[PDB]
């Protein structure tokens, strides 16, 4: 038994969820998605990205967790 580390890919996709949180708190709104994705440019419009915030926060609490940038990036649902 050598020792398998779990830390490099986990700190890559969670480090990007830390680019969401400008004041450092662990949950976000519409503009954080668009803002750091805005540095690139982004293929989607602001109407398509407002439909996305309504899809995943269905009930309407306020702000999203580690599981939305992490959980939609990992699992791809086939049709």
């Amino acid at each position: 038994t050598q020792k398998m580390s779990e830390k490099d890919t986990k700190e890559e996709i969670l480090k990007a969820f830390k680019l969401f949180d400008d004041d450092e708190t662990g949950k976000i709104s519409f503009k954080n998605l668009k803002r750091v994705a805005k540095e690139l440019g982004e293929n989607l419009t602001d109407e398509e990205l407002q439909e996305m915030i309504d899809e995943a926060d269905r009930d309407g609490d306020g702000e999203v967790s580690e599981q939305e940038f992490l959980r939609i990036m990992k699992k791809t649902s086939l049709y």
């Binding site: 890559e12 996709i13 990007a16 750091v36 994705a37 540095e39 982004e42 293929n43 990205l49 995943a56």
Partner: peptide, 17 residues
């Protein structure tokens, strides 16, 4: 789509060429 915006914000390090 949150999958298209997840690659778009997977940008975390850089891009390339």
């Amino acid at each position: 789509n949150w999958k298209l915006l997840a690659k778009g914000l997977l940008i975390r390090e850089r891009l390339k060429r």
